[PDB]
Design an enzyme around this catalytic site. Structure first.
Site, PDB file in Angstrom:
ATOM      1  CB  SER B 209      -2.019   9.208  -1.515  1.00 38.24           C
ATOM      2  OG  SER B 209      -2.545   9.087  -2.701  1.00 38.24           O
ATOM      3  CG  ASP B 275      -8.841   5.920   1.791  1.00 38.75           C
ATOM      4  OD1 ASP B 275      -9.081   5.694   0.505  1.00 38.75           O
ATOM      5  OD2 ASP B 275      -7.444   6.198   2.026  1.00 38.75           O
ATOM      6  CG  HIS B 312      -7.032   9.373  -0.264  1.00 35.43           C
ATOM      7  ND1 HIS B 312      -6.550   8.219   0.160  1.00 35.43           N
ATOM      8  CD2 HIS B 312      -6.240   9.926  -0.974  1.00 35.43           C
ATOM      9  CE1 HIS B 312      -5.268   8.093  -0.366  1.00 35.43           C
ATOM     10  NE2 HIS B 312      -5.097   9.549  -1.198  1.00 35.43           N
TER      11      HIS B 312
END
EC number: 3.1.1.-
Lengths: 386, 390
Positions: B209, B275, B312
């Site tokens: 991320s 995602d 995620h």
């Protein structure tokens, strides 16, 4: 001073203002009750929800009642389990979401403990403690109090939890009552030649059970070793945030009992002690506190805040009366952070995190072989100790 | 691992190693992925604490503390330095988190570590790891010119404003970010390269991320500016490889052009098909590196339907890597490494309730509240470490 501390004289002159010994004494037994909350598995996502996390061995050390607790010298001898023949709130009986966990119908409901030789010297006698686990219509109670007392009625909920059995269960094949009566009986017999007391404690649900249990024991004469029916010991309940337990006949029966004493600590803003508001009487002596007087407590509070046990113990620790003009000041060294075990009760100013009680990783643990398992339960067959 | 390391680290762009997935690569990817997750496991997200935004653990025995010792024979690294970052512009709480009331503008942002003599034998070389901490918790960032990073020779390269701010911003008043996250990282990687100049070395950078964007930026910085060489030996460059997960986009088409012209860089972007984060920002950005698609919806262990958080989460990603057999409708899913499925639930309720693993289970005992010798109760959720150079 133990006999007066245990209410021999109904705590006359010891409550307003609060006797310093009694302040510590009340907290001492209240902590016994709180230990119930601290071992109770409330994680419904676990197969062990409704069970104890800790075993009997070193129980008090595990729940943080060893460090700086020189008077908490007790051995837990027996775990107590209860069920209910009628549906009750999840606050009373809580189960794995699986509906296929350690038990389908039973919960850990408390424990029975006794002072060892050291604690016996410290408390001035052999103290038998029964501690009832707390909160996460009227029925005839002849089956409890006998034909002689056939007008006594009890809250259906308290009665069901106290008296119900699960015939298919290794835990509640005998009811909570009988488990307790049996173990207290063994202890009384073992220490029959010695000065003994029975102390019973509980908060919320546990307070109603403590009150019922105590009355049962005294009214049926279970406060005597079977080998020495001539020798009754004092039975006293320290209860906190107690709902009402029985009707006016329950009170009449209570009021006629020589050997019983109950100290009901009540937090004024806490409404639970008012329920059920119709058809019930209170028993015992009352000790009012008011946690709104604490400068540490969040204002305004709420249901959970006003009710929580550590809130109650914080109030006892610092109370100087409940009048508008009375002081509030901690007269024992009691960490204010304890308030936040199960609520966000303190002023955010205090910088204590809310609702902080939890096993590391909720009990998830890395194993030797590198697997990760939910380990939130210690093994204990709960067999009678030798 | 030792024999194949250069291919495992992308020397041939992982050609023929991805579909189907090479077994060594499967374990290799997870091994770096775990390096990133350790960042999450050491990051204090409790905004009710004075230490929110800091590391819970010290550098000492760091990996044992975050559960990467037991059954992790290949994780023999020493953490040498903690990395801190700030932002000159406002950014989401997921990026920088602060006490509700240790620091006003900085967060622990990652660490730098190296394989000890044992690890070195095991991984086939001295591996320098830089692990960027990722997105936590829950303004339409534009593109900025990155001249200050890639020099006037590369004056058309543009970078996401948020990634740039976190990477380059300083707080003059702070012992933690008086120098920016970039410089802290360059300086420690420099020290390590110089120390081990006479041996075969690699730099591996990982992140998920937010950490993935940082990993990508920092890798490109390091290779394009030639920081992948000891100062004493400008003639010796080592490979730089980023293993990133759930990577948002980092730069514009000129960033890609610069990237594509670099000999010594390799990036494996693992992407979970459901995602959506890896799609952001959806306009004006280009992706860099080689891609490795997985699909956690193929796992019979994962709750269906999933959500943003589930699709995620990093451990979800590593569970996907552990069992992926391709992303086609008809492909199998089967765990080909022994990876506890319960790890999925560190930060989400991601597994089927049928699995009977509690959701969101990562927490210090009592949230760090601890009984002291004198019977007081204090919040102890931080180990002391001055973070001084070793």
């Amino acid at each position: 001073r133990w006999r007066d501390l245990s209410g021999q004289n109904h705590w006359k002159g010891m409550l307003q203002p609060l006797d310093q010994d009694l302040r510590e004494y009340i907290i001492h037994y209240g902590e016994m009750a709180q230990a119930g909350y601290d071992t109770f598995n409330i994680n419904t996502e676990s197969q062990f929800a409704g069970a104890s996390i800790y075993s009997r061995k070193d129980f008090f050390a595990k729940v943080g009642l060893e460090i700086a607790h020189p008077y908490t010298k007790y051995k837990v001898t027996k775990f107590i389990y209860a069920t209910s023949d009628i549906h009750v709130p999840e606050s009373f009986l809580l189960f794995p979401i699986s509906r296929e966990g350690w038990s389908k119908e039973s919960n850990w409901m408390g424990y029975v403990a006794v002072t060892d030789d050291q604690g016996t010297a410290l408390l001035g006698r052999r103290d038998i403690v029964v501690s009832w686990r707390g909160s996460v219509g009227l029925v005839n109670a002849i089956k409890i109090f006998g034909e002689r007392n056939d007008q006594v009625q009890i809250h259906q909920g308290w009665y069901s939890i106290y008296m119900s059995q699960d015939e298919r269960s290794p835990f509640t094949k005998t009811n909570a009552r009988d488990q307790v009566l049996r173990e207290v009986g063994r202890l009384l017999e073992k220490y029959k030649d010695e000065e003994v007391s029975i102390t019973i404690c509980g908060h919320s649900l546990g307070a109603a059970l403590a009150t019922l249990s105590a009355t049962d024991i005294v009214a049926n004469g279970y406060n005597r070793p079977k080998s020495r029916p001539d020798k009754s010991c004092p039975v006293t309940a320290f209860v906190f945030a107690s709902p009402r337990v029985g009707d006016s006949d329950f009170r009449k029966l209570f009021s006629g009992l020589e050997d019983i004493r109950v100290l009901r600590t009540r937090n004024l803003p806490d409404v639970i002690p008012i329920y059920p508001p119709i058809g019930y009487s209170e028993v015992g002596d009352e000790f009012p506190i008011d946690t709104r007087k604490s400068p540490y407590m969040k204002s305004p509070g709420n249901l959970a805040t006003f009710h929580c046990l550590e809130g109650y113990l914080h109030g006892v620790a610092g109370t100087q009366g409940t009048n508008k003009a009375d002081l509030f000041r901690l007269d024992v060294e009691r960490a204010i952070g304890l308030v936040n075990k199960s609520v966000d009760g303190l002023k955010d100013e205090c910088m204590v995190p809310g609702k902080w009680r939890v096993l590391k990783n909720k009990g998830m643990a890395q194993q030797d072989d590198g697997s990760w398992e939910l380990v939130d339960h210690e093994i204990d067959d709960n067999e009678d100790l030798d």
